[PDB]
Amino acid sequence: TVIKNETGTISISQLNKNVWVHTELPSNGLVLNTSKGLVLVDSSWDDKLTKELIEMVEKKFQKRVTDVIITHAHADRIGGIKTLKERGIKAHSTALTAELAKKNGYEEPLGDLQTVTNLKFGNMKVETFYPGKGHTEDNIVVWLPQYNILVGGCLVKSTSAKDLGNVADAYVNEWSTSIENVLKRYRNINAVVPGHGEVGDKGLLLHTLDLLK
Ligand SMILES: [Zn+2]
């Protein structure tokens, strides 16, 4: 299914039940329909878009957003940390992400995740994994054990991606090893959600490795 706000669209497309995708204007993220509330992988550009998304989601799902997992300290992922914060929503991040958000003048996320972290939200089991530097020093990936769904963030580029994008903060040299790391840990990947663009499969990890050489 596909549901949208109105202009400066926010849209929720659906993967399996319980797993939807949130994208705002494009930047992607996840909405996990869990027994213990709604869990979000990444907020959005800013407070407005994150405030609107939270509101559209609690409405449809008749449930409160309780947790959010930030994949890296750049605006598109950490823009609404003030909203999450004031609202009592748990913003998870690795320690680096948090100190980087701090360094850039943002509310500090939890800095609670370690290299590999296994979270559990009711039925939902979520695995966070720091594969290494790539698009950004702190970028982590999210893996849903029960669906073989990988949220690759900006470490992974969509089919339509013909360049790496903003490489200002990137580690182009480590980047390929990092993606190799994901591929070694995650054999049999059903769907891969990029930080921007269309959702695809393992092929997306290979496309990016191609944009690296
Ligand atoms: Zn970024």
- DSSP readout, 26-74? -B--EEEEETTEEEEE---SSHHHHHHHHHHHHHHHTS-EEEEE---SS
> Which two tokens mark 151?
């949220």
From 18, 22, 67, 74, active-site residue: 74
**Obtained via which technique?**
X-ray
Residues facing residue 2 across a β-bridge: 13
Active site residue 33: no
| Alpha helices for the chain (secondary structure H) | 47-61, 75-78, 81-86, 95-103, 172-185, 203-211
Q: In angstroms, what CA-CA distances link 198 with 151, 166, 212?
A: 12, 18, 19
Residue 94 CA to residue 112 CA, distance in Å, equals 5
| Residue 125 labeled ligand binder | no
Residue 18 CA to residue 35 CA, distance in Å, equals 9
Residue 16 CA to residue 45 CA, distance in Å, equals 26
Residue 186 CA to residue 200 CA, distance in Å, equals 15
Spell out the domain ranges in the chain: 1-213
CA of 75 to the centre of ligand 1 (A): 7
Nearest residue to 68 via CA among 85, 46, 55, 48: 85
- Do 139 and 153 touch, CB atoms closer than 8 A? yes
From 42, 67, 76, 138, active-site residue: 76
Active site residue 18: no
Write out the residues surrounding ion ligand 1, Cβ under 5 A: 74, 154
Residue 37 CA to residue 22 CA, distance in Å, equals 16
Contacts of 97 (CB under 8 A, 6+ apart): 70, 71, 72, 73, 78, 109, 111, 138, 140
Residue 69 CA to residue 39 CA, distance in Å, equals 8
From 104, 123, 166, 190, active-site residue: 166
Helix/strand/coil for 174: helix
CATH 3.60.15.10 fits 1-213, yes or no: yes
CA of 106 to the centre of ligand 1 (A): 15
CA of 76 to the centre of ligand 1 (A): 7
Active site residue 72: yes
| Residue 74 labeled ligand binder | yes
CA of 71 to the centre of ligand 1 (A): 9
CA of 167 to the centre of ligand 1 (A): 9
Active site residue 207: no
